[PDB]
Amino acid sequence: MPPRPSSGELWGIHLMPPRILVECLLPNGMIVTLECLREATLITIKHELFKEARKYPLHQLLQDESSYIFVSVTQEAEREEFFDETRRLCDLRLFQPFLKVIEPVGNREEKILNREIGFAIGMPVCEFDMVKDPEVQDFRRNILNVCKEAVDLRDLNSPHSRAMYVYPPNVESSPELPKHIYNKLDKGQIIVVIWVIVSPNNDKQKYTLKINHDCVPEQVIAEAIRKKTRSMLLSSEQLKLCVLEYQGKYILKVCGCDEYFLEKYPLSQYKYIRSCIMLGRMPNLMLMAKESLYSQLPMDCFTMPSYSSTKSLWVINSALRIKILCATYVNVNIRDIDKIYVRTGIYHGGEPLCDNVNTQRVPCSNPRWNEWLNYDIYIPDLPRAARLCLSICSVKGRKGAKEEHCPLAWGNINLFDYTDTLVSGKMALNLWPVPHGLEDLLNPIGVTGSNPNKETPCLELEFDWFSSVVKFPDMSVIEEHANWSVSREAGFSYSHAGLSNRLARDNELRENDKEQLKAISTRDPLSEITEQEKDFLWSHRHYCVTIPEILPKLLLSVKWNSRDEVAQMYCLVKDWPPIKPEQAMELLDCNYPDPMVRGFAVRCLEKYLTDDKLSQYLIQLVQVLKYEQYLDNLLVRFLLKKALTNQRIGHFFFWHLKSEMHNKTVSQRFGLLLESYCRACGMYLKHLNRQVEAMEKLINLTDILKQEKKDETQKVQMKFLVEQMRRPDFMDALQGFLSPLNPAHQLGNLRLEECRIMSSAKRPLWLNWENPDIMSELLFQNNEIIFKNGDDLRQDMLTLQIIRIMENIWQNQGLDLRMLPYGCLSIGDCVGLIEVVRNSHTIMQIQCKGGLKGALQFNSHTLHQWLKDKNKGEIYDAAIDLFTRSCAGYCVATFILGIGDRHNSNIMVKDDGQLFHIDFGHFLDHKKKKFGYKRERVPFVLTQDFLIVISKGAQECTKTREFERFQEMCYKAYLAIRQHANLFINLFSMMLGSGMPELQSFDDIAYIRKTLALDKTEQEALEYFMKQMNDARHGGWTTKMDWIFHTIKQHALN
Amino acid sequence: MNNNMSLQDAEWYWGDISREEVNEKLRDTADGTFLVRDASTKMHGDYTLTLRKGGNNKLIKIFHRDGKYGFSDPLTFSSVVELINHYRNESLAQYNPKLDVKLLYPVSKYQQDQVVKEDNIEAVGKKLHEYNTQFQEKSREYDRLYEEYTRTSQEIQMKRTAIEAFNETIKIFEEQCQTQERYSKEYIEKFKREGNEKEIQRIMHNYDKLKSRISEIIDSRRRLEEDLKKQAAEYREIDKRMNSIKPDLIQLRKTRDQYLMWLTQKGVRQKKLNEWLGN
């Protein structure tokens, strides 16, 4: 039982025929074939069946149909009983179209939930109950503590706390308004519009306030109360008492979407309100009685599920020896491969704890070694996160004296389990395929543990026995051993500064020492850290506390294969000052496997990471879950509790975990995690099922258009799409659910006249929904989402995330470069959603509308001419300025990241002049990993077009005062990102295990060291940037002959 | 240990190469292979010894102050060979105890026929072209083979899923046969005892329908298991074909990277290395 191979309604069939024959197996042994509609509910089918069943022998033996339920086999190989009989036949995921009639047993509500959960996580929860692994069963039970703990924190301050969970405030991370946003106000004031639905008839009433941006929602309500009852003749004392009594009896909500102002932040800190300052948009809020909202809130009821002699390591005086016994098979041609051998190594993150050890060489057809491998490490020196990395390697040497080694299949193993027990006895490990592009012999970054796929080479090992269970020592024993070894090792004589100064005197407070610790901590995380600097950092480890953000580099300077050194490091981290999250997240990547370090990193997140920043880094924080040794850890317990107490976090927590459930390397870890989230998140699971079911209908419908109907015309495919979305099973699923891109938006009835299949080859679906909000006319009357099945969206998702962080860095330094990081969520294997940007067009669409019929070569002024026509008069200067600041930020963003092919097809412009880039998918210059050149000459095609706009149409654009201002924005912005180069290396570093082709090893991330000139000084970097931009110009002598195909007329010059 | 030892012909002098250029040259080589790049100290002077011990390159920074050359303060060496090169003879444990191994295989520039093995002067001036053409052709063959490998992996996994669904489906139809014999037997003995004959054949006829269904499904699993066996073997052969190309493709990538410095004598033009080197 796995997930699903296809998203079709039957095994091997995308669409059931409008009427289908269903085998029914009655309780009396009879078998009845029954023609059912594919959209028939199980209620209907059972009714039709029991009427048809009277025509069959032994019919009087059947009870009433209310005493039976259906059971059948689903495409996930599961024996599913269907208690919820409201479900249509085509949405049962039946393997074969048959149904067995049985009497229902057990708790109906429990079994309905376990299906809803299994459907949402893409994996039947009965598969978890089948696992013999004690760590899996321990995780399922023990993690319920986090669930109960969070549900109590929700229902503690009822009903306000339940409203905070369901509708968390969407605020910026800081209330301080940078001065270029404050001066966009009117003397620090903003005009808001408060709406009220007054009704026997649902009429709408308007009150216009003018308030400071510091107002808490209670004061905005209070000012509304004031303006309302000023005409209502009242005494001053009653009015001052009327405002004071009823200000906390109402709440404020954004008109159009479900974003409430439930908490006491200043008004301008709310993301909707700060945005309206930037865009110069009129805020339209909706005031409702606080009790009218608490009535909508569903009662979240959480139910506990059904499944709810040791010698110390440090007294084992022996060296580590592991036995390589044999391997089942390897797939090599005996005539082309000489011999095979198992290559081993003991690792801590990425660094070996001793010399790698190889087995003897054996022939391929007989992989048996029976060979003890003896390692250069003592058993008590093994760090907590110590692992065994191995692989089967083939060797062939047919040319001269040179020899060729190649890895065949690999596997990693934690040397202690989740209970701190040193592995013992025999152990069989199923190896993994060699990743594409990997040429090394070992793979210490890949996932630990056996391949769940058991139809692979199976390498048998044996570990040593010590006549007792060996446990990693307790933390009390580790700290005590360090106290009498931290002052017994560090503090001898002064001559210990010239042999191995890891034993020097402990008060060197010189500046040459203090200023080197400053330079070391500011180096980028990918820089080489040398052996002296490791000895130097370690020798001054006690002063590193004064510069606490050096902790990453000091941790790479500890000798992890020495228990005495590690123990001292444990005591230093125990009391280490918490540091900012942007630096604690580095300790959570693949480079820091130790539990005590990662604990510290999580304690810094509990202390400084706001829910807004957790939503900002959620991608990376889910990714690093793959690097945790065990299922039960401090990072997941922190992430789980946070998602269980903020539904906006839990939404994207679900989807990002769900998105990777196809990757079998982590599908169990994320499955077990998604289960415990689903089982405890409260009412949101139902909302998610409407979302999950909505996507499956779109995946199945796009599979058809991409496979069966691929050879048909657009008009015939479009005909097929219309008739499919009008079926009752499609209208039920694709209407009335929450947009996965942004759950604040409600998707109502489909506007089928606006839905279409987009022309591109992946068959994207352009989908349009009504907005069921009563104030939908003031926000989005249209919710437009593009569904794409065929392309990997993770790069687009990462690039867009990065772009948003760059925009924050520029805002904090007074640089107003307006980006547009549109929505993009990946919902599974090469399938996801894209938020549409209303009233925006590609540069090509604007030139195709310029123009002059049959242009072949577009004129350079069409874009500037379009902007003049859209922003005539006084609003012209505000539009040109927006185009300038928006073009500048993307220019620097696309250079630092290496996003290529910037032309009129993936650059878009809003009517009001804001420019933004779309379609990334390829960054860090990874097409050139096969050729070598990381910098040639690819002139930006749209220079002259943009220069005309920036220079407001001057004839000689390069000499205008406006272009010189444009250069300074890019120069200032580029250095701004360069000053934060450690964060972006850290973010990409957290994404290594995700499986993106452009992001496989740390050498892939090294591209931004060159574009950010991290090996230079600040002046040499800026000169480097001006040169790279100068090379990337474009001017008169352009070989512009064709724009569709880009043919080039004569002048071949040969 | 000589009369005069020069700076250029030393195997480690690379000039202004970056950190990434060092990663390519120090990989899977034998004891004794090392190189130098520009030091992390912004001043000129530092030379780096890189010894492979247990398959690891240890980085040891030599802090550089004043116009002298050495390891640490004060930089008081007399020749560069004493600094880095002479370690080839005696043990390297005096430098750092983390590299207790010697230096045996030198990748020599003048041992050309050991790496550059073309016979005539006309055949040498193409070994970068021949090695790169062999890389791009065999890389895309392995690319095409790996895409069949991942695809066949998915299809094989789906057949195992469909087989487990057949096993449970067959498990369920088997119960319907054993349930029918429980109920009908108390009646087939009675409908003979009650003279009813239409009812006897209807129960037999209905059990014949169940018979035909189970027989058709078992055959449907049989044809799936037959197809699983053949594709699992087709898979193993796809792996054999890749595992024979993989070690040859690894060397061609390193060989082409080795020959990047060799074509200096047959210098193919600069932008020509945008077509004489690939595209």
Ligand SMILES: Cc1cc([C@@H](C)Nc2ccccc2C(=O)O)c2nc(N3CCCCC3)c(C#N)c(=O)n2c1
């Ligand atoms: C008006 C303008 C100018 C440039 C270049 C030619 N010029 C400069 C750019 C910045 C700062 C100074 C100059 C400077 O030469 O003065 C430009 N380049 C772009 N790309 C992407 C990043 C890599 C280079 C090519 C994009 C896009 N996408 C873009 O919109 N561009 C817009």
Ligand SMILES: Cc1nc(NC(=O)N2CCC[C@H]2C(N)=O)sc1-c1ccnc(C(C)(C)C(F)(F)F)c1
């Ligand atoms: C963020 C965004 N916004 C848009 N808005 C319009 O396309 N509009 C807006 C209304 C008319 C119509 C137009 N100009 O024609 S498209 C878009 C986007 C982002 C990323 N990729 C794409 C495509 C087209 C490559 C994909 F993936 F959908 F195939 C589009």
